[PDB]
Each structure stands twice: as structure tokens, then as C-alpha cells.
């Protein structure tokens, strides 16, 4: 019965009379008995929402905000707070300089977001993200925990809400949370917000330049698995955009160590990050190589077996580390001394898919650059399998599988053979698989790289008299004559050589 009265009183002009009622009203909502009475009365909820909104008293706000907070623990409560436009008003309390009001506000908003349909869209219209992000400078970690979780529910599956967070300086703020705080629950909710934004094609660099890479890597060995995993997935999504950032040295040592974790998923993520973090970046290549990188990546392939989800990123990483940097030879070389060859060469066999076979053809290409690798690669049965894949690849291009064009395969294999043919023993085998007729036909490719390695393989081979007549007798002379004139010095250099030895 009191409800209809206070409702009246809250709509009074004498503000003194109003705050008086919000106090009482807020004392009635403590007991579920009187609480229901309130939820059940639209004039009571509106009343309150309108008072908290319009009020200018630092306690009428407290009590009004306090009241609808205690109303949001139940289903019928949330609807009443929603149907009376209470969200725009709660977003308005997010600017209060009074913590209580603030606290009561982010909690009620969190509740509506979690259970009230229409809440998410309402908070965005009311400009909730911008305000929420402004509140990331607060020093109360629990407040930050609920605030950050709000951003995660609003941003999830919403690029717009994502672009607004980003445009409000959000990234650099969450990233600073990861540098300063040790409260696991905060770190978690934040990490989850960074995770959702790292898939966005605008947020990534914002997160990378603010130092997100180094700050997600700070908690890689914290005890919390959920924290670790989230930090890893986020680091993986950011990795293709982090290839040129300095200071990755420590995150590199940690990632290596994690390959030896007990969680395949952790190992999988880590092999992913090392794979991307090693692309075209010499500083990173050497760091991986310095802290046990090769042996660890190699051990990862072995441990993984058929799991392409692991072998692939890991094999790509070995590929990156074995080229274009001062110690590429030291790497190429180290993969043998750590017993990698057996499992590498084995990966070209079934049931390996093309994505992996391609990447593995590249590692092999690179590993053959090292003379001490020729005999080993041969004795593991590389030439025969490299030779039949090329054949399957060549025939397709005459007969874009799995995202892998067969011409790239045609080039790599023939590329690896061009290199392996630097040994006399290897040469015998290559000839022995009647390949000369196939490389010759490879002279007629519209692609230069292909002509180069075909010419290239044929130059090595032709230094053997008989094999030289084999090529000549194959019709090589004609096409080579044209290749003689290419602008691609490589193709012309090798063009001119076969003819000479021929």
C-alpha cells in the first residue's frame, strides 16, 4: 500500500520530499516481500528510474541506483527496469564521481546484459561502450572485472561495438590492465575482451603497438589455465600482424618452453605463434634458434604424429628458421643433429594433406642447402617421394586443390631436387627414376621459377655424359634455345648451361 504513496512522493516538486522517499523506498527493497510489490508496479519503477536519472543529490542517486540494483536479481525485475528505460539512465550513472552509485550501476548493467533480451542493443544506443571504456582507469580491480566483462558481452560478435571500443582508446587500456594487475579474475575477463578484439581487422595492430604481445606473454606461466589459454589464443590471432615488432625476445623463450607443456592445445597454440612470429624476421629466427627452438619444434612434430594441427605450424616454423638469416646453415644443419629428418621426410607420405606436404617440401628444399644433409635426406628415401609428388602435381596442371595450387608443389619438389642433385650419388637416383623426360617438359612452363629449377636440375644432371645425351635425345635443345633469351637471368643462366654441357 505504501508503494502508491511513495510513487506519489517521488513525483513531488519539493526535492527534499523526494530524497526522503527514495531513502524509504530503498529500505523497502531490502526485503523480498516488499521488493516484489515494487517490481510489480510500473509507476514505481519508472518513478525511481526517473528520479535517479534527474536527481542531483549524491544519495538520492545512491538509493535509487541501489534500489533498482536489488531489483535486478530476478527475472521480473529486469523486465521492469528495462521497460521503463532504465538502461539509458544506468549508463548515465556510469559518470558519477561517487563509487557507490558507480558500483550499483555497473552491477545492474552486468545483470541486464547477462539475462535481459534487448539489453545489449540498449546499452550501445545509450553510449555504454564509450563510457565503459572511460572507466578502465579506475583502481578498484573488482570494479574493473565487472566493467571489462561488460565490454566482452557487448563486443562479442559485433564489429561495430568493436570499432567503437577501439576508437575510444580501449586496446591500450586493456593492455595496460594486463601489465599492472595480478587479480586473476580481472586478468581473465580482460584477456577475454582482448581475445574477441584480436579477430577484428583494425584492432590487431592497436593491440600490438600498445605492447599487447609482451603483456599477454607476462601471464603465460601464471597458474591459471583459463588465463594461460586465453592469452595464447589471443596471441595466436595477433601473430600474423606482429611480425615486425621489436621486443619479442622473451615471449619467444617462453613459447619455446611451452612446446613441452602437457596440454596438446597449449603446444598447438604455441607452435602457431612461433610459426607466424618467425616469418621474415631475422631477429626472431635467431632467438628461436638460440633457446632450444629446433630440437623443441622437432620434438613437437614427433610427439604430434598425424595431427596436422600441430605438425603444420611447427613444420612451417622449422622452414622459416632454416632460411634468410645469418645462421640458416646452422639451423638447416641442426635439424639433423637433433634427429628431425626421419619425421620430416615421413610427412610427405600419406595421410599428410597438401597444406602440410607443401610446407614440408619447403623445409626439405631448405634443408638440402646444407651439403651434410644430402646423404641423410637420400637414405631416408626423400628423392623417390619428392619425385612422385611432382608427378602428381604436374599431371593435375594438365588433368587449386585444398587451397594449394599444384604449380607451387611442382616448383618446390623440382626445387628440392635441383638442390639435392648437387651430390653425385643423388644424381644417379634422380636419373634412375626416369625423371629427365619430365624436367624437359618442365621447360615449357609459363612460370619462370619452374623453368629455372627445371633448367637448374637439368644442368646438374647433364654434367654426366650419358645423362647429357639423355636430355639432348629428349628434345631439350629446342625449348632451351628459347629459354636462352629470357629476361630472368636465372632461367637464361641455366638455359645456357645445359646446352653447353649438352
Amino acid at each position: 500500500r505504501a508503494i502508491p504513496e511513495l510513487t506519489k512522493l517521488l513525483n513531488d516538486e519539493d526535492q527534499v520530499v523526494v530524497n526522503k522517499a527514495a531513502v524509504m523506498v530503498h529500505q523497502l527493497s531490502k526485503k523480498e516481500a516488499s521488493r516484489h510489490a515494487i517490481m510489480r508496479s510500473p509507476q514505481m519503477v519508472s518513478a525511481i528510474v526517473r528520479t535517479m536519472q534527474n536527481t542531483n543529490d549524491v544519495e538520492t542517486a545512491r538509493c535509487t541506483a541501489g534500489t533498482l540494483h536489488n531489483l535486478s536479481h530476478h527475472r521480473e525485475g529486469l523486465l521492469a527496469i528495462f521497460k521503463s528505460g532504465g538502461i539509458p539512465a544506468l549508463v548515465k550513472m556510469l559518470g558519477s564521481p561517487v563509487d557507490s552509485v558507480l558500483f550499483y550501476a555497473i552491477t545492474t548493467l552486468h545483470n541486464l546484459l547477462l539475462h535481459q533480451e534487448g539489453a545489449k542493443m540498449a546499452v550501445r544506443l545509450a553510449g555504454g561502450l564509450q563510457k565503459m571504456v572511460a572507466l578502465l582507469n579506475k583502481t578498484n580491480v573488482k570494479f574493473l572485472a565487472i566493467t571489462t566483462d561488460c565490454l566482452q558481452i557487448l563486443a562479442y560478435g559485433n564489429q561495430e561495438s568493436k570499432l567503437i571500443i577501439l576508437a575510444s582508446g580501449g586496446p591500450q587500456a586493456l593492455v595496460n590492465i594486463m601489465r599492472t594487475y595480478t587479480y586473476e579474475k580481472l586478468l581473465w575477463t580482460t584477456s577475454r575482451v582482448l581475445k574477441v578484439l584480436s579477430v577484428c581487422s583494425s584492432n590487431k595492430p592497436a593491440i600490438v603497438e600498445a605492447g599487447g604481445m609482451q603483456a599477454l606473454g607476462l601471464h603465460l606461466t601464471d597458474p591459471s589455465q583459463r588465463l594461460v589459454q586465453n592469452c595464447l589464443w589471443t596471441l595466436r590471432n595477433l601473430s600474423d600482424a606482429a611480425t615486425k615488432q621489436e621486443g619479442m625476445e622473451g615471449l619467444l623463450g617462453t613459447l619455446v618452453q611451452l612446446l613441452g607443456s602437457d596440454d596438446i592445445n597449449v603446444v598447438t597454440c604455441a607452435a602457431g605463434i612461433l610459426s607466424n612470429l618467425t616469418c621474415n624476421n631475422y631477429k626472431n629466427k635467431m632467438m628461436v634458434c638460440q633457446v632450444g627452438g629446433i630440437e623443441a619444434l622437432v620434438r613437437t612434430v614427433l610427439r604430434a604424429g598425424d595431427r596436422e594441427d600441430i605438425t603444420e605450424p611447427a613444420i612451417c616454423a622449422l622452414r622459416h628458421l632454416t632460411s634468410r638469416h645469418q645462421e640458416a646453415e646452422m639451423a638447416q644443419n641442426a635439424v639433423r643433429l637433433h634427429y628431425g629428418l626421419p619425421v620430416v621426410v615421413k610427412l610427405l607420405h600419406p595421410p599428410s594433406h597438401w597444406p602440410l606436404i607443401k610446407a614440408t617440401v619447403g623445409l626439405i628444399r631448405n634443408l638440402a642447402l646444407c651439403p651434410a644433409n644430402h646423404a641423410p635426406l637420400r637414405e631416408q628415401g626423400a628423392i623417390p617421394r619428392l619425385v612422385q609428388l611432382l608427378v602428381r602435381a604436374h599431371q593435375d596442371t594438365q588433368r587449386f586443390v585444398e587451397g594449394v595450387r599444384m604449380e607451387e608443389i611442382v616448383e618446390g619438389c623440382t626445387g628440392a631436387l635441383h638442390i639435392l642433385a648437387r651430390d653425385v650419388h643423388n644424381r644417379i637416383v634422380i636419373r634412375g627414376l626416369n625423371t629427365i623426360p619430365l624436367f624437359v617438359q618442365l621447360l615449357y612452363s609459363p612460370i619462370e621459377n619452374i623453368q629455372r629449377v627445371a633448367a637448374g636440375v637439368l644442368c646438374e644432371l647433364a654434367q654426366d655424359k650419358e645423362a647429357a645425351e639423355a636430355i639432348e635425345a629428349e628434345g631439350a635443345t629446342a625449348p632451351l634455345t628459347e629459354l636462352l633469351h629470357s629476361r630472368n637471368e636465372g632461367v637464361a643462366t641455366y638455359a645456357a648451361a645445359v646446352l653447353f654441357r649438352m
Binding site: 572485472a145 562479442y156 618467425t278 621474415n280 634468410r324
Partner: peptide, 24 residues
């Protein structure tokens, strides 16, 4: 240029007790 190629990853994906002690 751009030798080594990248792999693209886009894995997008208990506060009740936190909230009660934040108000009380």
C-alpha cells in the same frame, strides 16, 4: 618480397560473488 608466408588464425571464442562484495 614477403618470403615466409603467414597462417591466419581468428579464434574469437564467477563474478556473482565479485559483485556482491563490491556493493556490500
Amino acid at each position: 618480397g614477403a618470403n615466409d608466408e603467414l597462417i591466419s588464425f581468428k579464434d574469437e571464442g564467477d563474478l556473482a560473488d565479485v559483485k556482491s562484495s563490491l556493493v556490500n
